[PDB]
Amino acid sequence: GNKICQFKLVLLGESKVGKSSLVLRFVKGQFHEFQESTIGAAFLTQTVCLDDTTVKFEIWDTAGQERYHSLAPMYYRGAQAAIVVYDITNEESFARAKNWVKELQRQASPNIVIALSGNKADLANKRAVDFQEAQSYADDNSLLFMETSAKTSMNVNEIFMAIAKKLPKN
Ligand SMILES: Nc1nc2c(ncn2[C@@H]2O[C@H](COP(=O)(O)OP(=O)(O)NP(=O)(O)O)[C@@H](O)[C@H]2O)c(=O)[nH]1
Ligand SMILES: [Mg+2]
Numbered sequence: 001g002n003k004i005c006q007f008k009l010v011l012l013g014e015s016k017v018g019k020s021s022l023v024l025r026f027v028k029g030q031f032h033e034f035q036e037s038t039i040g041a042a043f044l045t046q047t048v049c050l051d052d053t054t055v056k057f058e059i060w061d062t063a064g065q066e067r068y069h070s071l072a073p074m075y076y077r078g079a080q081a082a083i084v085v086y087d088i089t090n091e092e093s094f095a096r097a098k099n100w101v102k103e104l105q106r107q108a109s110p111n112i113v114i115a116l117s118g119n120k121a122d123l124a125n126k127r128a129v130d131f132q133e134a135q136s137y138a139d140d141n142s143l144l145f146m147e148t149s150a151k152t153s154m155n156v157n158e159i160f161m162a163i164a165k166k167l168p169k170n
Contacts, residue, residue: 001052007167008058009160010076012104013085014096015064018119021150022085023061026160031151038063041075048157048164055164076108081163085117088147089126094118094134101141113166115144115159122149 011019020038024030027046042061047054060075062068076082082104086097097116104114116138118129131147138145144162148155 001054003053003169004056005053005167005169006056006058007080007164008060008078009081009083009163010060010062010079011083011085012062012072012076012100013064013117014087014090014093017064017085017087017090017093017097018150019064019083019085020061022083022117022119022148022156023059025150025153025156027059029153031153033151037065040068040071046160048161050161050164050169053169055167055169057160057164072103073107076104076112079108079112080167081113081115082108083115083117083159083163084143085119086129087120088118088129088131088134089120089123091128094129098137101143105141113144113163114142115146115163117159118145118147119150121147121154122152 027044040063044059047056062075084097084100086093118134146155146159
C-alpha cells in the first residue's frame with residue numbers, strides 16, 4: 001500500500017517496570033539487562049507495515065520516577081496513544097499503572113487509545129498480578145491489554161501493532 005500515517009505515542013509507568021526496554025525492543029530489536037533509569041524522557045521512532053499503510057510511531061519513553069511526574073503532561077498532551085506499563089511481579093507497580101490510566105482518561109486527549117502492558121512476563125515464576133484480574137481491569141476500563149516481555153520479545157511487536165490498527169487511518 002501507498003498510504004502513510006504518523007502517530008504520537010507515550011509510555012508511562014512506575015520506574016523499573018521496563019518502559020525503556022519495551023521501546024528499545026520494538027525500535028532496535030535490543031534488550032539490555034542492565035538498562036539504566038531514564039532521566040526526564042527519551043525519544044525514539046519506528047515505522048511498521050500495517051496492511052496498506054506505513055505507520056510511523058513517534059515515541060516518548062518517559063522516566064517513571066515520581067520526581068518526573070510533573071513533566072508527564074508535556075509528553076502525553078498531544079499523544080494519540082499511550083502504553084501504561086507495569087511489572088507482573090510487582091503489585092505496587094500495577095496499582096501505579098491504574099493511577100496513570102486515570103490521569104490519562106481525565107487529562108489527555110479524549111480519543112487517546114490506551115494500552116496496558118503487563119511486562120516481565122518471562123518472570124511468571126515470581127508473578128504477583130493475576131493475568132485474568134488484569135484482563136478484567138483492562139476490559140472494564142477500555143484498555144488494550146497484553147502481557148509482554150522486553151527480554152524475550154513476547155508480544156512486543158504485537159502490542160504496538162495492535163495500537164496501530166486501532167488508530168484512525170480512514
Ligand atoms: N526479566 C525482564 N527484565 C526486564 C524486562 N523489561 C525490562 N527488564 C529489566 O528491568 C530493569 C528496568 O528496565 P527499564 O527498561 O530500564 O525500566 P524503565 O521502566 O525504563 N525505568 P525508568 O522509568 O526509571 O526509566 C532492567 O534491568 C531491564 O533489563 C522484561 O520483560 N523481563
Ligand atoms: Mg526508562
